[PDB]
Design an enzyme around this catalytic site. Structure first.
Site, PDB file in Angstrom:
ATOM      1  N   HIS A   1       0.829  -1.204   0.000  1.00 48.94           N
ATOM      2  CA  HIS A   1       0.000   0.000   0.000  1.00 48.94           C
ATOM      3  C   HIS A   1       0.865   1.256   0.000  1.00 48.94           C
ATOM      4  O   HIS A   1       0.679   2.158  -0.831  1.00 48.94           O
ATOM      5  CB  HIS A   1      -0.929  -0.056   1.218  1.00 48.94           C
ATOM      6  CG  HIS A   1      -1.697   1.200   1.500  1.00 48.94           C
ATOM      7  ND1 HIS A   1      -1.136   2.301   2.113  1.00 48.94           N
ATOM      8  CD2 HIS A   1      -3.007   1.494   1.321  1.00 48.94           C
ATOM      9  CE1 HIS A   1      -2.060   3.235   2.271  1.00 48.94           C
ATOM     10  NE2 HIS A   1      -3.205   2.767   1.805  1.00 48.94           N
TER      11      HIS A   1
ATOM     12  N   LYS B   1     -14.003   1.518   1.465  1.00 47.88           N
ATOM     13  CA  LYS B   1     -13.358   2.676   2.087  1.00 47.88           C
ATOM     14  C   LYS B   1     -14.326   3.850   2.216  1.00 47.88           C
ATOM     15  O   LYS B   1     -14.250   4.599   3.200  1.00 47.88           O
ATOM     16  CB  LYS B   1     -12.116   3.096   1.303  1.00 47.88           C
ATOM     17  CG  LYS B   1     -10.980   2.101   1.364  1.00 47.88           C
ATOM     18  CD  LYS B   1     -10.590   1.768   2.785  1.00 47.88           C
ATOM     19  CE  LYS B   1      -9.321   0.910   2.813  1.00 47.88           C
ATOM     20  NZ  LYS B   1      -8.955   0.536   4.220  1.00 47.88           N
TER      21      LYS B   1
ATOM     22  N   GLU C   1      -8.426   8.551   0.405  1.00 49.33           N
ATOM     23  CA  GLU C   1      -8.070   7.240   0.933  1.00 49.33           C
ATOM     24  C   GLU C   1      -7.590   6.357  -0.204  1.00 49.33           C
ATOM     25  O   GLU C   1      -8.228   6.309  -1.266  1.00 49.33           O
ATOM     26  CB  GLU C   1      -9.241   6.580   1.663  1.00 49.33           C
ATOM     27  CG  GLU C   1      -8.930   5.185   2.172  1.00 49.33           C
ATOM     28  CD  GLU C   1      -7.829   5.139   3.232  1.00 49.33           C
ATOM     29  OE1 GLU C   1      -7.524   6.155   3.894  1.00 49.33           O
ATOM     30  OE2 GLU C   1      -7.264   4.053   3.412  1.00 49.33           O
TER      31      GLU C   1
END
Ligand SMILES: [Mn+3]
Ligand SMILES: [Mn+3]
Length: 197
Positions: free
Chosen positions: A71, A138, A120
Site C-alpha cells: 500500500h 473505504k 483514501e
C-alpha cells in the site's frame, strides 16, 4: 495575510464525486531490477527511460512496515505514510471524543478557501470488480466521520483503489497518472512476494 481566508462561507456539506473505472496502458514497459538485502532495497532506476512509467520511483528503500509495504509503496509518490487524525484538523464533535475523531485516512488536505479534501488509498489482489468493492468499502469506512465533520468545513471524499490492470477512483486521472499507480503497484507486488520469504 491570506485574503482567500476572508471569503463568504461555502456550503457545509459532503461531496462525493462518482467512482470511475480506469484501465492501465503500460504495455511492454521496462520494469526496474531490485536487490533485497537483510530489509534494504536498491532499485535500478537507471534502467528506466526518461519519462516512462515509473519515473517517480526512488532508488533506495528501507523497510514492522512489511504488512503495509504494498500500500505505502504504491501511493508513495502521492503521499507519505501518515497518522494524521480527523481530530487534529476538526477538533472533537459534541464536546466529547469518540472513535471517529481518531480515524486516520491517507490524506486530509485543508485549503485557504476552507474546503477539506479527504483521500483514501487502497489495493486489491483481485480484478476490477474487486477494486470497485474495495473503493466502496473505504467510502463506507469514512463516510460517517466525513458527513458529521462537513458541518464544520465542507469535505470532498476521494478514493483511489488499484488493481493489477487499472484503478477505480473518483478523481479525474490522466492515462499517465493511472499508469504510475498501477506500475508502482505491480512492482510492489513483485518485491513483497520476495520480502515475505
Ligand atoms: Mn492509512
Ligand atoms: Mn489506505
Amino acid at each position: 495575510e491570506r485574503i482567500l481566508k476572508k471569503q463568504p462561507a461555502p456550503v457545509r456539506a459532503l461531496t462525493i464525486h462518482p467512482l470511475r473505472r480506469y484501465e492501465s496502458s503500460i504495455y511492454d514497459t521496462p520494469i526496474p531490477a531490485y536487490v533485497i538485502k537483510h530489509v534494504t532495497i536498491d532499485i535500478a532506476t537507471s534502467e528506466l527511460a526518461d519519462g516512462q512509467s515509473g519515473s517517480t520511483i526512488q532508488p533506495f528503500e528501507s523497510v514492522q512496515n512489511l504488512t503495509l509495504f504494498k500500500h505505502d509503496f504504491t501511493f508513495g509518490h502521492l503521499a507519505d505514510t501518515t497518522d494524521k487524525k480527523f481530530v487534529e484538523v476538526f477538533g472533537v464533535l459534541e464536546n466529547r471524543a469518540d472513535d471517529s475523531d481518531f480515524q486516520s485516512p491517507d490524506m486530509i488536505i485543508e485549503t485557504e478557501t476552507g474546503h477539506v479534501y479527504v483521500v483514501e488509498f487502497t489495493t486489491t489482489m483481485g480484478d476490477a470488480n474487486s477494486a470497485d468493492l474495495a473503493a466502496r468499502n473505504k467510502i463506507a469506512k469514512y463516510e460517517i466521520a466525513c458527513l458529521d465533520r462537513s458541518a464544520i468545513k465542507p469535505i470532498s471524499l476521494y478514493i483511489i483503489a488499484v488493481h493489477f490492470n487499472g484503478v477505480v477512483s473518483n478523481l479525474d486521472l490522466s492515462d499517465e497518472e493511472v499508469n504510475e499507480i498501477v506500475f508502482r503497484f505491480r512492482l510492489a507486488r513483485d518485491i513483497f512476494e520476495e520480502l515475505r520469504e
